[PDB]
């Protein structure tokens, strides 16, 4: 417990503040990165699941990758309010050890080729629990940095927690072709050209790394509905929460979907070998986009951006085999552009919402607008994660009813266009 914590005063900070804050920042970043690794796990397990003994339909796999985001987008609003109670250490220790549950469990189901779809539901859920660790890891570290250094630190904290998608989607398809836990009896299943596939690996790998990050959480970290429900009801928390759906939502959605979509249209290719550039270029462009959202205009960048997500989305139609050039590289490039503008906008829309909530709602109110803005950020991120349920669920429900991704893709055009015209009109 840190009694007497006043970090604003340059003296206290420079002498014995910034070192506490920095340590807490690095522990916080490792736990967030792993939480994202676990959160988006299914995105690279499902592409392999039917290769291992299972017989799951396409709509089922897409439902699996889209399912976690339903549990994460709903638990962020409680997780944020959970930190000023147990402390951002005991609630990092706890909120990080309970991921061992779905990791060790998912390592178990994947071995049994007779296990029911119903079990992978509750594992998709419990896996989705580690997407609420963003809200709590973002609430917790703010106290550690001066009211005028919370820009850089939050940027590093969230901005690296993101990277965990990109990391997991690269560690996981690389480790399965190595019998690391064969001494424990982990099933491996042979495939063309010597490929032996132990697919519990991609799930049991994180049990050690999550342990270490739990102990360091217990060792190195320090414990230091009222106005929120007000801030919510204003009818401009909604047309804004929508734009962060089309940006951040479509970094999550495409993160869960892209591996699998690129499996159905192009079975002859090996996507796990290169599905990760997406989420990586995504995080980088995101935190790059945050920096130019206030250095070249807020609304401007979001606009010119959505124009590019709409043009990319329409461009997607000309690559799918059958309804256009059945070429993979073009499909890929267009998806990279999709991730790029998704992250770029994902930032451009956040600093925008900021300078429209500590601005338009700072005139009615100089330290009380900070509250409303904050609450609006919590909401918008939480209702920003339920876009990672939608996109792969629409690829699912399009491949199910029609066999094609076209039925969902058109909805994506319509969405990006309406979004463009709504950035146009109001803001």
Q: Report the CATH number that the domain containing residue 96 is assigned in CATH.
A: 1.20.1250.20
- Cα–Cα dist 36/87, whole Å: 21
Q: What is the DSSP letter of 276?
A: S
Helix (H, G, I), strand (E, B) or coil at 99: coil
The last residue of one of the domains, among 224, 259, 286, is: 224
Residues 177 and 252 in one domain: no
- Cα–Cα dist 99/48, whole Å: 22
- Cα–Cα dist 129/180, whole Å: 27
Structure token pair of residue 262: 């690129």
Residue identified by tokens 């005063």 is 9
Closest C-alpha among 131, 181, 184 to residue 382? 131
The domain total for the chain is 2
Maximum Cα–Cα distance across the chain: 69
- Cα–Cα dist 156/406, whole Å: 37
Residues 324 and 349 in one domain: yes
381, 76 in Cβ contact below 8 A? yes
- Cα–Cα dist 159/157, whole Å: 5
Residues 164 and 147 in one domain: yes
Closest C-alpha among 217, 149, 169 to residue 44? 169
Q: How far is CA 179 from CA 112, 183, 211, 286, in A?
A: 17, 8, 21, 36
Residue identified by tokens 């019998």 is 179
Structure token pair of residue 409: 């893709």
Residues 209 and 229 in one domain: no
Neighbours of 37 (CB within 10 A): 26
Residues 276 and 369 in one domain: yes
Which residues have CB under 8 Å from 217's CB, separation 6+? 27, 31, 89, 92, 93, 96
Q: How far is CA 7 from CA 15, 86, 224, 241, in A?
A: 10, 21, 11, 32
Question: How much of the chain is helix, strand and coil, in % rounded to 5?
Answer: 70, 0, 30
The phi and psi torsions of 165 (rounded to 5 degrees) equal -60, -65
Residues 420 and 339 in one domain: yes
The last residue of one of the domains, among 224, 241, 258, is: 224
Q: What is the DSSP letter of 320?
A: S
Residues 175 and 97 in one domain: yes
- Cα–Cα dist 235/380, whole Å: 13
Residues 208 and 233 in one domain: no
53 Cα distance to chain centroid? 29
Element (H, E) at 190: strand 189-191
Structure token pair of residue 341: 């503008």
- Cα–Cα dist 297/419, whole Å: 18
Structure token pair of residue 269: 């290719």
> Within a 13 Å sphere around the CA of 229, how many CA atoms are in the beta-carbon half?
3
- Cα–Cα dist 397/391, whole Å: 10
Residues 320 and 192 in one domain: no
- Cα–Cα dist 343/346, whole Å: 5
Give me the domain span that covers residue 340: 225-427
Residue identified by tokens 């480790």 is 175
Residues 125 and 43 in one domain: yes
Residues 210 and 251 in one domain: no
Element (H, E) at 373: helix 369-382
The last residue of one of the domains, among 173, 189, 224, is: 224
Helix (H, G, I), strand (E, B) or coil at 189: strand
Closest C-alpha among 107, 116, 108 to residue 41? 107
- Cα–Cα dist 176/202, whole Å: 6
Which residues have CB under 8 Å from 380's CB, separation 6+? 237, 240, 241, 244, 353
Element (H, E) at 196: strand 195-197
- Cα–Cα dist 166/423, whole Å: 29
Residues 9 and 147 in one domain: yes
């Amino acid at each position: 417990l840190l009694r007497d914590w006043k970090p604003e005063n340059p003296a206290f900070w420079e002498n014995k503040g910034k070192h506490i804050a920095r340590r807490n920042l690095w522990i916080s970043v490792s736990c967030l990165l792993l939480a994202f690794c676990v959160w988006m796990l299914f995105s690279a397990v499902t592409v392999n699941l039917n290769k291992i003994g299972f017989n799951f339909t396409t709509d089922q796999l897409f439902l699996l990758t889209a399912l976690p985001s339903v549990s994460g987008a709903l638990l962020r609003v409680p997780y944020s309010f959970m930190v000023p109670i147990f402390g951002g250490r005991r609630w990092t220790v706890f909120s990080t050890a309970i991921l061992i549950i779905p990791c060790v469990w998912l390592g178990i189901a994947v071995q049994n080729p007779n296990t029911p779809f119903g079990i992978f539901i509750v594992i998709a859920l419990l896996c989705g629990f580690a997407g609420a660790n963003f809200a709590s890891s973002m609430g917790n570290i703010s106290f550690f940095f001066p009211k005028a250094k919370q820009g850089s630190a939050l940027g590093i904290n969230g901005g690296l927690g993101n990277l965990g998608v990109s990391v997991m989607q690269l560690v996981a398809p690389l480790v399965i072709f190595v019998p690391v836990f064969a001494f424990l009896g982990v099933n491996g299943v042979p495939q063309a050209d010597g490929s032996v596939m132990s697919l519990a690996n991609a799930a049991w790998i994180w049990v050690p790394l999550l342990a270490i990050a739990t102990i360091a959480a217990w060792s190195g970290m320090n414990d230091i509905i009222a106005d929120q429900l007000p801030v919510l009801q204003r009818l401009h928390l909604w047309l804004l929460s929508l734009l962060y759906l089309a940006t951040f939502g479509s970094f999550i959605g495409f993160s869960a979907g892209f591996a699998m979509l690129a499996k159905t249209q192009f079975p002859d290719v090996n996507i796990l070998r290169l599905a990760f550039f997406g989420p990586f270029i995504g995080a980088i462009a995101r935190s790059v986009g945050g920096a130019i959202s206030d250095k070249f205009g807020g609304v401007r960048v979001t606009l010119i951006n959505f124009i590019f997500m709409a043009i990319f989305s329409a461009l997607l139609f000309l690559t799918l085999p059958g309804t256009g050039s059945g070429n993979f590289i073009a499909f890929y490039a267009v998806f990279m552009g999709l991730f790029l503008t998704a992250g770029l906008g994902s930032g451009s829309t956040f600093q925008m919402i900021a300078v429209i909530f500590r601005q338009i709602t700072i005139y009615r109110a100089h330290k009380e607008a900070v509250t409303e803005t904050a609450a609006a950020l919590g909401f918008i991120s939480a209702i920003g994660a339920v876009g990672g349920f939608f996109i792969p669920q629409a690829f699912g429900m399009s491949l199910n009813m029609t066999g094609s991704p076209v039925g969902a893709m058109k909805v994506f055009l319509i969405f990006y266009i309406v979004c463009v015209l709504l950035t146009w009109l109001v803001y």
